Structure formats: C-alpha cells, structure tokens
Amino acid sequence: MAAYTIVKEEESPIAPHRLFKALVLERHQVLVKAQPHVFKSGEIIEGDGGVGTVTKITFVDGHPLTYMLHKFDEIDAANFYCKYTLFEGDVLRDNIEKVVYEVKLEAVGGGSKGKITVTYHPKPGCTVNEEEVKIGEKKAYEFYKQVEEYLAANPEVFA
Ligand SMILES: O=S(=O)(O)c1cccc2cccc(Nc3ccccc3)c12
Ligand SMILES: O=S(=O)(O)c1cccc2cccc(Nc3ccccc3)c12
Ligand SMILES: O=S(=O)(O)c1cccc2cccc(Nc3ccccc3)c12
Ligand SMILES: O=S(=O)(O)c1cccc2cccc(Nc3ccccc3)c12
C-alpha cells in the first residue's frame, strides 16, 4: 500500500491445460527441466497440490541465489486458476516481503489466453526496486518461452 504490479495478457499456441500444468502445477519440476544449468531440484515439502502445499526449488551450487519456497493459496485447477506466493529463500532481495502471483488461463481455439498479475510486496514501510520488477518479468517470461517451445514440439507432453 501502495504496491507495484504488472498486468500482462498473453497468448500462445498451447492449450491452457498443458500450460497450467507446466507453468503452475508442476512448475517446480519443469524449472529443473528447461534450465538444468541454474536449478538442482524442485520438490514439494508438505501439501498435495492444493492450498497450503509448499514447494522448494534449489539452485545449482555455483548460483548466487540459494533456494525458493512457494505456498499454494488458491487453486481451481479445473478453471486454469492459481494464486501463489513466493515467501522464503535467498532470492527475495531486501525491500520486498513476498511476491504474489495470480494466474488464470482460458482456451482460445487451438491454444491459450493467459492473464497474469504479479504484485510486488515491499516490507514494512520500505520501497520496492523497479529493476527487480524488470528482472522478475524477464526470468519468468523466458522460462515460459522455453516451455512453450517445448510443449510445441512434443504435443504428447501433458496432453
Ligand atoms: O524441459 S521441458 O522440455 O521444458 C518440459 C516441460 C514440461 C514438461 C516436461 C516433461 C518432461 C520433460 C520435459 N523436458 C525434458 C526435455 C528433454 C529431456 C527430458 C525432459 C518437460
Ligand atoms: O506470462 S508469464 O510471465 O510467462 C507467467 C508468469 C507467472 C506465471 C505464469 C503462469 C502461466 C503462464 C504464464 N505466462 C503466459 C505466457 C503465455 C500464455 C499464457 C501465460 C506465467
Ligand atoms: O540475467 S540476470 O541474472 O538478470 C543478469 C544480470 C546482470 C548481469 C548478468 C551477467 C550474466 C548473467 C546474467 N544472468 C544469469 C542468470 C542466471 C544464470 C546465468 C546468467 C546477468
Ligand atoms: O521469476 S521466476 O519465474 O520465479 C524464475 C524462473 C526461471 C528462472 C529463474 C531464475 C532466477 C530467478 C527467478 N525468479 C525471479 C524472482 C524474482 C525476481 C527475479 C526472478 C526465476
């Protein structure tokens, strides 16, 4: 209050159900698949796949960042809908309390329409860097481009 937020709207030739599974439900695992150079493991530490499930993504040894943990706060997996929060790990940078992601997908002929909102939460009475915004939008977005391309040339996967 006030918080920094991106609002993006995208579309890819990939059906929502395949994207929501690769970029949400099994993200922790798909990150170690598209970027084996920068991530060692991604796991669930308690939970199912439902609100309160916590994941852990661990960086490779020669990376500056250390690990991340996210909590699943709202899933409606049928509707392609997720709100999830980066709460812990060396990743955070000092003026931001958490990062809060809200995803909804929808089908669109042969593919997808995502609307994503990423809200950057400063810690008690601090300010949020705008460089981090641009870094957080480039790192998620390339990863999506790697995944898209990948779900594109193997229709089999998550299909
Ligand atoms: O990493 S990605 O292709 O992005 C990927 C994205 C989403 C789901 C995946 C499932 C299996 C293997 C993958 N990759 C992979 C690639 C070559 C060999 C083994 C696995 C998946
Ligand atoms: O927008 S991104 O920054 O990659 C992004 C960031 C965070 C979570 C996302 C979840 C699903 C799809 C995304 N992108 C997307 C791309 C194409 C079509 C629909 C969604 C997500
Ligand atoms: O992209 S950033 O991290 O923002 C970045 C920002 C500024 C300078 C960078 C130099 C090399 C690699 C980067 N990225 C990178 C990240 C992980 C693995 C390898 C390279 C740099
Ligand atoms: O963005 S994510 O989608 O989690 C992501 C996806 C793929 C690779 C990433 C590497 C480093 C940091 C990330 N996140 C991040 C968090 C805050 C600021 C900048 C980057 C990465």
Residue numbers in the entry: 1 to 159
Task: Please quote the paper that reports this structure.
Hyp-1 is a 165-residue pathogenesis-related class 10 (PR-10) protein from the medicinal herb St John’s wort (Hypericum perforatum). The mystery shrouding the function of PR-10 proteins is in contrast to their comprehensive structural characterization, which reveals an almost hollow molecular core surrounded by a seven-stranded antiparallel β-sheet gripped around a long α-helix (α3) supported at the C-terminus by a fork of two shorter helices. This characteristic fold, termed the PR-10 fold (or the Bet v 1 fold after birch pollen allergen, which was the first PR-10 protein to have its crystal structure solved) strongly suggests the binding/storage of hydrophobic ligands.
The maps show excellent electron density for either one, two or three internal ANS molecules (at sites designated 1, 2 and 3) per Hyp-1 protein and 29 interstitial ANS molecules. Fortunately, the structure shows that there is no direct interaction between the fluorescing species to further complicate the spectra. The Hyp-1 molecules are arranged into dimers through intermolecular β-sheet formation between β1–β1 strands, although the protein is monomeric in solution. Rigid-body refinement of the 28 copies of the protein molecule in the C2 solution confirmed that this solution does not obey any higher symmetry, though it is pseudo-symmetric with pseudo-tetragonal symmetry. The final electron-density maps are of very good quality, showing unambiguously the main-chain trace of all 28 independent protein molecules (A, B, … Z, a, b), clear conformations for most side chains and good density for all copies of the C-terminal helix α3, which is often disordered in PR-10 structures.
